[PDB]
Amino acid sequence: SIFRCRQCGQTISRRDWLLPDHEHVVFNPAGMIFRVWCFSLAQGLRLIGAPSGEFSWFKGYDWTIALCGQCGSHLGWHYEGGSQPQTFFGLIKDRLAEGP
Numbered sequence: 001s002i003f004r005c006r007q008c009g010q011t012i013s014r015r016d017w018l019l020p021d022h023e024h025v026v027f028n029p030a031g032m033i034f035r036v037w038c039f040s041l042a043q044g045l046r047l048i049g050a051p052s053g054e055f056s057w058f059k060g061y062d063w064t065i066a067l068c069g070q071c072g073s074h075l076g077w078h079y080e081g082g083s084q085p086q087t088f089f090g091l092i093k094d095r096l097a098e099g100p
């Protein structure tokens with residue numbers, strides 16, 4: 001029901017906050033594959049830098065790197081500047097732990 005940072009246990013999100021498919025399998029320009037779950041809402045992150053559109057997986061959205069606010073582990077990206085919705089989070093599924 002709750003998603004925590006796999007590395008340190010920081011509270012991040014909830015199954016209830018998943019945003020549809022909620023799963024997207026993508027590759028960055030360094031050829032790294034991420035299984036990304038989209039969330040309407042997340043907490044306990046630190047958004048680093050200003051947004052960029054470069055190589056955005058989601059048409060009309062700019063991304064900022066989302067670290068775990070506690071341990072600094074890269075948990076995914078915040079997406080902004082789009083429409084329906086304006087903002088959402090793309091979190092790397094295998095860097096989260098699910099439970100009570």
Ligand SMILES: O=C1CC[C@]2(CC(c3ccc(Cl)cc3Cl)=NO2)C(=O)N1
Binds near residue numbers: 029077
């Ligand atoms: O939506 C996204 C999130 C982030 C991103 C873009 C990206 C990147 C951008 C510029 C440079 Cl110079 C180097 C990198 Cl390694 N890495 O992952 C991606 O591909 N799509």
Ligand SMILES: [Zn+2]
Binds near residue numbers: 005008
């Ligand atoms: Zn963490």
